[PDB]
Amino acid sequence: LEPKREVCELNPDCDELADHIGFQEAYRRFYGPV
């Protein structure tokens, strides 16, 4: 797994994850590999 969540921070879709946990599950929802 490489730096992929860099874009996640921009899109509120998975960015909201960092609000209560901020791990990867949210990003995996629309990608898969972390």
Side-chain angles (χ1 to χ4, degrees), residues 1 3-5 7-8 10-34:
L1 178 286
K4 296 174 182 178
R5 281 63 63 67
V7 183
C8 184
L10 290 302
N11 55 68
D13 297 358
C14 58
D15 183 61
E16 183 179 62
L17 187 69
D19 294 60
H20 60 179
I21 59 184
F23 287 61
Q24 57 179 296
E25 58 181 62
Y27 185 109
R28 302 183 66 178
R29 303 180 185 294
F30 59 115
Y31 273 69
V34 182

mmCIF file of all heavy atoms in Angstrom, unseen atoms left out:
data_model
loop_
_atom_site.group_PDB
_atom_site.id
_atom_site.type_symbol
_atom_site.label_atom_id
_atom_site.label_comp_id
_atom_site.label_asym_id
_atom_site.label_seq_id
_atom_site.Cartn_x
_atom_site.Cartn_y
_atom_site.Cartn_z
ATOM 1 N N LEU A 1 0.825 -1.205 0.000
ATOM 2 C CA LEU A 1 0.000 0.000 0.000
ATOM 3 C C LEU A 1 0.863 1.260 0.000
ATOM 4 O O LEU A 1 1.738 1.429 0.852
ATOM 5 C CB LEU A 1 -0.944 -0.009 1.213
ATOM 6 C CG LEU A 1 -1.838 1.229 1.383
ATOM 7 C CD1 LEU A 1 -1.033 2.422 1.875
ATOM 8 C CD2 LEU A 1 -2.547 1.563 0.075
ATOM 9 N N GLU A 2 0.599 2.142 -0.962
ATOM 10 C CA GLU A 2 1.331 3.401 -1.091
ATOM 11 C C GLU A 2 0.411 4.585 -0.787
ATOM 12 O O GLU A 2 -0.799 4.409 -0.636
ATOM 13 C CB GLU A 2 1.909 3.528 -2.507
ATOM 14 C CG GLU A 2 3.056 2.526 -2.695
ATOM 15 N N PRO A 3 0.969 5.811 -0.683
ATOM 16 C CA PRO A 3 0.181 7.021 -0.392
ATOM 17 C C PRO A 3 -0.983 7.208 -1.368
ATOM 18 O O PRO A 3 -0.810 7.744 -2.465
ATOM 19 C CB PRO A 3 1.201 8.155 -0.537
ATOM 20 C CG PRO A 3 2.520 7.510 -0.289
ATOM 21 C CD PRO A 3 2.404 6.116 -0.835
ATOM 22 N N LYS A 4 -2.166 6.745 -0.962
ATOM 23 C CA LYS A 4 -3.368 6.838 -1.793
ATOM 24 C C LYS A 4 -4.434 7.731 -1.154
ATOM 25 O O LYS A 4 -5.215 8.372 -1.861
ATOM 26 C CB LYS A 4 -3.946 5.443 -2.041
ATOM 27 C CG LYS A 4 -3.030 4.534 -2.844
ATOM 28 C CD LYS A 4 -3.593 3.126 -2.942
ATOM 29 C CE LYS A 4 -2.652 2.199 -3.696
ATOM 30 N NZ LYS A 4 -3.172 0.805 -3.758
ATOM 31 N N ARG A 5 -4.469 7.768 0.184
ATOM 32 C CA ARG A 5 -5.450 8.578 0.910
ATOM 33 C C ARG A 5 -5.203 10.085 0.759
ATOM 34 O O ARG A 5 -5.987 10.890 1.267
ATOM 35 C CB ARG A 5 -5.476 8.194 2.393
ATOM 36 C CG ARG A 5 -6.271 6.928 2.687
ATOM 37 C CD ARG A 5 -5.668 5.697 2.020
ATOM 38 N NE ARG A 5 -4.321 5.401 2.512
ATOM 39 C CZ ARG A 5 -4.045 5.006 3.760
ATOM 40 N NH1 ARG A 5 -5.022 4.796 4.640
ATOM 41 N NH2 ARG A 5 -2.783 4.803 4.122
ATOM 42 N N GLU A 6 -4.134 10.473 0.050
ATOM 43 C CA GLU A 6 -3.835 11.890 -0.166
ATOM 44 C C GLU A 6 -5.045 12.596 -0.781
ATOM 45 O O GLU A 6 -5.367 13.727 -0.417
ATOM 46 C CB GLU A 6 -2.614 12.054 -1.081
ATOM 47 C CG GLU A 6 -1.334 11.693 -0.317
ATOM 48 N N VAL A 7 -5.718 11.902 -1.704
ATOM 49 C CA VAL A 7 -6.908 12.435 -2.366
ATOM 50 C C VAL A 7 -8.116 12.392 -1.426
ATOM 51 O O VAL A 7 -8.973 13.276 -1.464
ATOM 52 C CB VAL A 7 -7.241 11.642 -3.648
ATOM 53 C CG1 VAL A 7 -8.439 12.247 -4.365
ATOM 54 C CG2 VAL A 7 -6.032 11.583 -4.572
ATOM 55 N N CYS A 8 -8.170 11.354 -0.585
ATOM 56 C CA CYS A 8 -9.263 11.175 0.373
ATOM 57 C C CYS A 8 -9.480 12.430 1.220
ATOM 58 O O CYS A 8 -10.619 12.799 1.506
ATOM 59 C CB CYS A 8 -8.971 9.982 1.285
ATOM 60 S SG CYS A 8 -10.308 9.592 2.458
ATOM 61 N N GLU A 9 -8.385 13.080 1.617
ATOM 62 C CA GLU A 9 -8.460 14.295 2.432
ATOM 63 C C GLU A 9 -9.270 15.389 1.732
ATOM 64 O O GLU A 9 -9.967 16.167 2.387
ATOM 65 C CB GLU A 9 -7.052 14.812 2.749
ATOM 66 C CG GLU A 9 -6.606 14.305 4.126
ATOM 67 N N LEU A 10 -9.177 15.442 0.400
ATOM 68 C CA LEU A 10 -9.903 16.438 -0.384
ATOM 69 C C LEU A 10 -11.392 16.105 -0.462
ATOM 70 O O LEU A 10 -12.237 16.961 -0.191
ATOM 71 C CB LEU A 10 -9.319 16.550 -1.800
ATOM 72 C CG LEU A 10 -7.926 17.185 -1.896
ATOM 73 C CD1 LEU A 10 -7.933 18.583 -1.293
ATOM 74 C CD2 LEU A 10 -6.884 16.311 -1.214
ATOM 75 N N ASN A 11 -11.712 14.863 -0.833
ATOM 76 C CA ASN A 11 -13.106 14.435 -0.943
ATOM 77 C C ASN A 11 -13.696 14.114 0.435
ATOM 78 O O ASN A 11 -13.216 13.226 1.139
ATOM 79 C CB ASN A 11 -13.240 13.235 -1.897
ATOM 80 C CG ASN A 11 -12.353 12.056 -1.525
ATOM 81 O OD1 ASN A 11 -12.557 11.406 -0.503
ATOM 82 N ND2 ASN A 11 -11.360 11.775 -2.361
ATOM 83 N N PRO A 12 -14.749 14.852 0.845
ATOM 84 C CA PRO A 12 -15.406 14.658 2.149
ATOM 85 C C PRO A 12 -16.008 13.259 2.327
ATOM 86 O O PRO A 12 -16.279 12.840 3.454
ATOM 87 C CB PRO A 12 -16.518 15.716 2.155
ATOM 88 C CG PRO A 12 -16.102 16.718 1.135
ATOM 89 C CD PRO A 12 -15.374 15.943 0.079
ATOM 90 N N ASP A 13 -16.217 12.545 1.214
ATOM 91 C CA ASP A 13 -16.792 11.195 1.248
ATOM 92 C C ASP A 13 -16.110 10.325 2.304
ATOM 93 O O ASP A 13 -16.752 9.879 3.257
ATOM 94 C CB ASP A 13 -16.675 10.528 -0.131
ATOM 95 C CG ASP A 13 -17.460 11.245 -1.223
ATOM 96 O OD1 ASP A 13 -18.139 12.253 -0.920
ATOM 97 O OD2 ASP A 13 -17.395 10.795 -2.385
ATOM 98 N N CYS A 14 -14.807 10.092 2.134
ATOM 99 C CA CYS A 14 -14.041 9.279 3.080
ATOM 100 C C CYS A 14 -13.271 10.149 4.080
ATOM 101 O O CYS A 14 -12.806 9.648 5.105
ATOM 102 C CB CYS A 14 -13.076 8.355 2.335
ATOM 103 S SG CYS A 14 -11.896 9.221 1.254
ATOM 104 N N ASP A 15 -13.145 11.450 3.788
ATOM 105 C CA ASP A 15 -12.440 12.374 4.679
ATOM 106 C C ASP A 15 -13.098 12.404 6.062
ATOM 107 O O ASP A 15 -12.420 12.587 7.075
ATOM 108 C CB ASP A 15 -12.418 13.784 4.079
ATOM 109 C CG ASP A 15 -11.643 14.772 4.933
ATOM 110 O OD1 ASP A 15 -10.429 14.559 5.136
ATOM 111 O OD2 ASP A 15 -12.253 15.757 5.399
ATOM 112 N N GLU A 16 -14.421 12.214 6.092
ATOM 113 C CA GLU A 16 -15.179 12.207 7.342
ATOM 114 C C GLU A 16 -14.689 11.104 8.290
ATOM 115 O O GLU A 16 -14.885 11.190 9.503
ATOM 116 C CB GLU A 16 -16.671 12.024 7.051
ATOM 117 C CG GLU A 16 -17.552 12.078 8.291
ATOM 118 C CD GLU A 16 -19.026 11.907 7.973
ATOM 119 O OE1 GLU A 16 -19.402 10.836 7.448
ATOM 120 O OE2 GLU A 16 -19.805 12.843 8.250
ATOM 121 N N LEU A 17 -14.051 10.070 7.731
ATOM 122 C CA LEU A 17 -13.532 8.955 8.524
ATOM 123 C C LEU A 17 -12.574 9.449 9.612
ATOM 124 O O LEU A 17 -12.651 9.011 10.757
ATOM 125 C CB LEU A 17 -12.807 7.955 7.618
ATOM 126 C CG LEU A 17 -12.370 6.652 8.295
ATOM 127 C CD1 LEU A 17 -13.582 5.809 8.661
ATOM 128 C CD2 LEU A 17 -11.423 5.875 7.392
ATOM 129 N N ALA A 18 -11.669 10.358 9.242
ATOM 130 C CA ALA A 18 -10.689 10.910 10.182
ATOM 131 C C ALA A 18 -11.346 11.622 11.371
ATOM 132 O O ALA A 18 -10.702 11.834 12.400
ATOM 133 C CB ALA A 18 -9.748 11.863 9.457
ATOM 134 N N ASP A 19 -12.618 11.999 11.225
ATOM 135 C CA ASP A 19 -13.343 12.700 12.285
ATOM 136 C C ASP A 19 -13.569 11.822 13.519
ATOM 137 O O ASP A 19 -13.457 12.307 14.647
ATOM 138 C CB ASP A 19 -14.689 13.216 11.765
ATOM 139 C CG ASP A 19 -14.535 14.300 10.711
ATOM 140 O OD1 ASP A 19 -13.915 14.030 9.660
ATOM 141 O OD2 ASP A 19 -15.036 15.421 10.939
ATOM 142 N N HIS A 20 -13.905 10.542 13.317
ATOM 143 C CA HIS A 20 -14.160 9.644 14.449
ATOM 144 C C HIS A 20 -13.139 8.502 14.573
ATOM 145 O O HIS A 20 -13.010 7.917 15.650
ATOM 146 C CB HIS A 20 -15.594 9.085 14.401
ATOM 147 C CG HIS A 20 -15.935 8.282 13.177
ATOM 148 N ND1 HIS A 20 -17.170 7.699 12.990
ATOM 149 C CD2 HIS A 20 -15.208 7.967 12.080
ATOM 150 C CE1 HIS A 20 -17.185 7.061 11.834
ATOM 151 N NE2 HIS A 20 -16.007 7.210 11.261
ATOM 152 N N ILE A 21 -12.410 8.179 13.496
ATOM 153 C CA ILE A 21 -11.417 7.100 13.558
ATOM 154 C C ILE A 21 -10.199 7.371 12.662
ATOM 155 O O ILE A 21 -9.064 7.365 13.143
ATOM 156 C CB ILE A 21 -12.032 5.716 13.211
ATOM 157 C CG1 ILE A 21 -12.642 5.706 11.805
ATOM 158 C CG2 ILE A 21 -13.078 5.328 14.248
ATOM 159 C CD1 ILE A 21 -13.330 4.405 11.450
ATOM 160 N N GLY A 22 -10.435 7.614 11.370
ATOM 161 C CA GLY A 22 -9.345 7.884 10.443
ATOM 162 C C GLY A 22 -8.372 6.725 10.306
ATOM 163 O O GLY A 22 -7.245 6.797 10.800
ATOM 164 N N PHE A 23 -8.804 5.655 9.636
ATOM 165 C CA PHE A 23 -7.958 4.478 9.436
ATOM 166 C C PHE A 23 -7.732 4.193 7.951
ATOM 167 O O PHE A 23 -6.634 4.415 7.435
ATOM 168 C CB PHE A 23 -8.571 3.248 10.118
ATOM 169 C CG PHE A 23 -8.470 3.267 11.618
ATOM 170 C CD1 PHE A 23 -9.078 4.267 12.357
ATOM 171 C CD2 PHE A 23 -7.764 2.281 12.287
ATOM 172 C CE1 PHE A 23 -8.984 4.284 13.735
ATOM 173 C CE2 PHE A 23 -7.666 2.292 13.665
ATOM 174 C CZ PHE A 23 -8.276 3.296 14.391
ATOM 175 N N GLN A 24 -8.768 3.692 7.271
ATOM 176 C CA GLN A 24 -8.673 3.363 5.841
ATOM 177 C C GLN A 24 -9.991 2.814 5.282
ATOM 178 O O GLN A 24 -10.287 3.005 4.103
ATOM 179 C CB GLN A 24 -7.557 2.337 5.602
ATOM 180 C CG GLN A 24 -7.726 1.052 6.400
ATOM 181 C CD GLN A 24 -6.629 0.041 6.126
ATOM 182 O OE1 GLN A 24 -6.487 -0.449 5.006
ATOM 183 N NE2 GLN A 24 -5.844 -0.279 7.150
ATOM 184 N N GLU A 25 -10.762 2.114 6.127
ATOM 185 C CA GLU A 25 -12.040 1.513 5.722
ATOM 186 C C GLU A 25 -12.842 2.410 4.770
ATOM 187 O O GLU A 25 -13.332 1.938 3.745
ATOM 188 C CB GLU A 25 -12.884 1.175 6.959
ATOM 189 C CG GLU A 25 -13.190 2.373 7.848
ATOM 190 C CD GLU A 25 -13.999 2.001 9.077
ATOM 191 O OE1 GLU A 25 -13.501 1.205 9.901
ATOM 192 O OE2 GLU A 25 -15.132 2.508 9.216
ATOM 193 N N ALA A 26 -12.974 3.695 5.113
ATOM 194 C CA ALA A 26 -13.722 4.645 4.284
ATOM 195 C C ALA A 26 -13.163 4.717 2.864
ATOM 196 O O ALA A 26 -13.917 4.674 1.891
ATOM 197 C CB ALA A 26 -13.722 6.025 4.923
ATOM 198 N N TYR A 27 -11.839 4.821 2.754
ATOM 199 C CA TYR A 27 -11.176 4.890 1.453
ATOM 200 C C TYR A 27 -11.366 3.585 0.675
ATOM 201 O O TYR A 27 -11.534 3.602 -0.547
ATOM 202 C CB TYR A 27 -9.686 5.192 1.637
ATOM 203 C CG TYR A 27 -8.935 5.401 0.340
ATOM 204 C CD1 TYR A 27 -8.481 6.661 -0.017
ATOM 205 C CD2 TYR A 27 -8.687 4.346 -0.528
ATOM 206 C CE1 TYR A 27 -7.802 6.868 -1.200
ATOM 207 C CE2 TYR A 27 -8.009 4.544 -1.713
ATOM 208 C CZ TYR A 27 -7.568 5.806 -2.046
ATOM 209 O OH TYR A 27 -6.892 6.009 -3.228
ATOM 210 N N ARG A 28 -11.345 2.460 1.392
ATOM 211 C CA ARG A 28 -11.518 1.142 0.779
ATOM 212 C C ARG A 28 -12.914 0.978 0.168
ATOM 213 O O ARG A 28 -13.110 0.153 -0.727
ATOM 214 C CB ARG A 28 -11.276 0.037 1.813
ATOM 215 C CG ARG A 28 -9.895 0.089 2.449
ATOM 216 C CD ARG A 28 -9.671 -1.062 3.417
ATOM 217 N NE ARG A 28 -9.650 -2.361 2.742
ATOM 218 C CZ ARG A 28 -9.426 -3.522 3.362
ATOM 219 N NH1 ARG A 28 -9.193 -3.556 4.672
ATOM 220 N NH2 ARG A 28 -9.431 -4.655 2.667
ATOM 221 N N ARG A 29 -13.881 1.758 0.663
ATOM 222 C CA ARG A 29 -15.262 1.693 0.177
ATOM 223 C C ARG A 29 -15.363 1.990 -1.322
ATOM 224 O O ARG A 29 -16.181 1.388 -2.019
ATOM 225 C CB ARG A 29 -16.148 2.676 0.949
ATOM 226 C CG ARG A 29 -16.146 2.452 2.453
ATOM 227 C CD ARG A 29 -17.040 3.454 3.168
ATOM 228 N NE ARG A 29 -16.957 3.327 4.625
ATOM 229 C CZ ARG A 29 -17.376 2.260 5.317
ATOM 230 N NH1 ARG A 29 -17.969 1.240 4.701
ATOM 231 N NH2 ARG A 29 -17.213 2.225 6.635
ATOM 232 N N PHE A 30 -14.540 2.921 -1.814
ATOM 233 C CA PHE A 30 -14.567 3.286 -3.232
ATOM 234 C C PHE A 30 -13.258 2.934 -3.959
ATOM 235 O O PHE A 30 -13.047 3.359 -5.097
ATOM 236 C CB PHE A 30 -14.909 4.777 -3.408
ATOM 237 C CG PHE A 30 -13.968 5.740 -2.730
ATOM 238 C CD1 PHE A 30 -13.201 6.616 -3.480
ATOM 239 C CD2 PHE A 30 -13.858 5.779 -1.348
ATOM 240 C CE1 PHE A 30 -12.342 7.509 -2.867
ATOM 241 C CE2 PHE A 30 -13.003 6.669 -0.732
ATOM 242 C CZ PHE A 30 -12.243 7.535 -1.492
ATOM 243 N N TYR A 31 -12.401 2.135 -3.315
ATOM 244 C CA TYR A 31 -11.137 1.704 -3.919
ATOM 245 C C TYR A 31 -10.878 0.228 -3.632
ATOM 246 O O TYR A 31 -10.986 -0.613 -4.526
ATOM 247 C CB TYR A 31 -9.960 2.547 -3.417
ATOM 248 C CG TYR A 31 -9.719 3.809 -4.217
ATOM 249 C CD1 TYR A 31 -10.612 4.869 -4.170
ATOM 250 C CD2 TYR A 31 -8.595 3.932 -5.023
ATOM 251 C CE1 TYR A 31 -10.391 6.019 -4.905
ATOM 252 C CE2 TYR A 31 -8.367 5.078 -5.759
ATOM 253 C CZ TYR A 31 -9.267 6.119 -5.697
ATOM 254 O OH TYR A 31 -9.045 7.263 -6.428
ATOM 255 N N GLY A 32 -10.538 -0.077 -2.379
ATOM 256 C CA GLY A 32 -10.270 -1.451 -1.989
ATOM 257 C C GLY A 32 -8.954 -1.603 -1.245
ATOM 258 O O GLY A 32 -8.952 -1.915 -0.054
ATOM 259 N N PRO A 33 -7.809 -1.399 -1.931
ATOM 260 C CA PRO A 33 -6.478 -1.527 -1.326
ATOM 261 C C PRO A 33 -6.145 -0.373 -0.375
ATOM 262 O O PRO A 33 -5.363 0.518 -0.715
ATOM 263 C CB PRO A 33 -5.522 -1.531 -2.534
ATOM 264 C CG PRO A 33 -6.393 -1.620 -3.745
ATOM 265 C CD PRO A 33 -7.718 -1.041 -3.351
ATOM 266 N N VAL A 34 -6.740 -0.408 0.823
ATOM 267 C CA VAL A 34 -6.519 0.617 1.849
ATOM 268 C C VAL A 34 -7.025 1.992 1.402
ATOM 269 O O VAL A 34 -8.105 2.399 1.875
ATOM 270 C CB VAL A 34 -5.026 0.716 2.240
ATOM 271 C CG1 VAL A 34 -4.821 1.756 3.333
ATOM 272 C CG2 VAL A 34 -4.492 -0.641 2.680
#
